[PDB]
Design a binder for this molecule. Structure first.
Ligand SMILES: OC[C@H]1O[C@@](CO)(O[C@H]2O[C@H](CO)[C@@H](O)[C@H](O)[C@H]2O)[C@@H](O)[C@@H]1O
Ligand SMILES: OC[C@H]1O[C@@](CO)(O[C@H]2O[C@H](CO)[C@@H](O)[C@H](O)[C@H]2O)[C@@H](O)[C@@H]1O
Lengths: 272, 272
């Protein structure tokens, strides 16, 4: 029956600059006007992704679940739909299931990122994307590919690293990249964490941000510009996301239809 | 109850890496039947609110708190009411309770030493609000250090580590535009440091030549951006682990005098 618990299920493997607690606080700020408690339930990696979900349903430990790192064909989404556990996703699946969700428009972000580099005079653009299994990788990759076409620029190919690749190695990669004779003039990053490491490596090779190369990056809080005011920054509002995920879940638990409980936040360029 | 309540002020720093603390806790709780509820509160005027509410409701078997004052009402209240708890920080009021803390005194002392070693003569420090015990630890270590290393303090009282970053930056710029400048800085916050450096740089000041900076950080981040910052690591994930172990043992009867630890300043490998 009523547990008055919202389970937040988070992978322990997150980024340096995930500002995860801002997400936690957005959820909890909404839940404070209610009788709901927020339980944080970690899982370590991919091999145990379904473990906490099965465990919530087996013990009946939560009235609703928040999940993230959504795949287009997500077994968690399907399992909780079938088992009638109210849930909301941070991200979007694409499997013909209408569920509550909130996501950032990574497609629009990568498209507008290419445009901006093109406006900066840039002609050869690389992008650093998530692992391909997550839906937001396909959103980003799509927005970027569409952008390289619409803005009459070309892609500098990049397969080496990803958004989840070790920072020390992003840094080394960035250093060797700007010591190559073949190098790009623009970078789209889908992680503020990857961007930090990338810039460190760039500077280590005599490269000046804004001069020799332009960078567009997302960030989940306002940090990159104290650090490097020349980075073209886009804010992803992680606290807002936490608020919206909570809003949606509460309404789903009370029987509002999932179709009305869906939002997508748009990229906003940092005032910084 | 099977619930550990993590009581957290929503007012945290940008670079708090709070989730790293959360994950240290859950990593330990995973071998147990305990669930971690995250319980926020907004400010100081409601600090005791979640504490009274946990005990009125009986909604937890143990509590984790932080932002510890030397004469902390929460600590006294929970001691009196026999609610197992552990503090991230230390009180100083004749009550022996489980705790884990970081040695802020030793950090500020070793900070001043390092700056002295770099040939610096006039050292400023940015400390927390006076009400919290770690402020007194830091201010003490700094005070001893200025004496022991034959240098002088540059007086500062305009800001704290809880003062807004934009205002820290503006303060850092005007500070270097003055004819009275410190040549060394001790920071008790990775967040303030970031804003601080941005302000210095906007005044044409170079980190490592014109001024040296020692800063704590709760994860390895300061050196990617600014390699010349003398970084000390506070291990927040270890903190989370220790808080959890201590609380578990305290819940099962262990004497509090035996559940106390302080981690020491560790100089970051990415530091000069
Ligand atoms: O858990 C991933 C989840 O979030 C989104 C939103 O863009 O992808 C993000 O992953 C992290 C979640 O906070 C952040 O670093 C940033 O929001 C973004 O990379 C979803 O698309 C995805 O399901
Ligand atoms: O939460 C306050 C609590 O932590 C200590 C540990 O040094 O002070 C810290 O406050 C935050 C804890 O994560 C961080 O900003 C930073 O690690 C430090 O300033 C305790 O002394 C205090 O009670």
């Amino acid at each position: 029956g009523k547990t008055n618990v919202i389970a937040l299920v988070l992978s322990v493997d997150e980024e340096l600059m995930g500002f995860t607690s801002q997400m936690v606080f957005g959820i909890t700020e909404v839940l404070a006007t209610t009788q709901y408690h927020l339980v944080v339930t970690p899982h370590t990696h991919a091999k145990d992704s379904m473990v906490p979900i099965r465990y919530i349903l087996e013990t009946g430990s939560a009235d609703g679940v928040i999940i993230s790192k959504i795949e287009p064909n997500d077994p968690r989404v399907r399992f909780m739909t079938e088992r009638k556990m109210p849930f909301v996703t941070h991200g979007r699946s694409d499997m013909g299931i209408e569920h509550a969700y909130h996501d950032f428009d990574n497609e629009a972000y990568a498209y507008e990122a290419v445009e901006r580099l093109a406006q900066c005079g840039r002609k050869r653009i690389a992008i650093i994307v998530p692992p391909s299994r997550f839906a937001f990788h396909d959103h980003a990759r799509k927005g970027f590919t569409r952008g390289i076409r619409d803005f009459g620029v070309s892609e500098f190919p990049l397969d080496a690293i990803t958004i989840e690749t070790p920072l020390d190695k992003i840094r080394d990669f960035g250093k060797r990249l700007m010591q190559s004779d073949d190098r790009p003039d623009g970078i789209v990053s889908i992680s503020g964490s990857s961007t930090i490491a990338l810039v460190a490596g760039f500077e280590a090779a005599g490269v000046r941000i804004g001069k020799d190369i332009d960078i567009v990056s997302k960030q989940s809080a306002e940090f990159l510009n104290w650090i490097q005011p020349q980075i073209h920054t886009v804010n992803e509002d992680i606290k807002l996301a936490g608020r919206e995920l909570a809003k949606a879940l509460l309404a789903r638990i009370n029987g509002a239809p999932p179709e009305t409980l869906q939002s997508v936040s748009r990229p906003v360029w940092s005032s910084m």
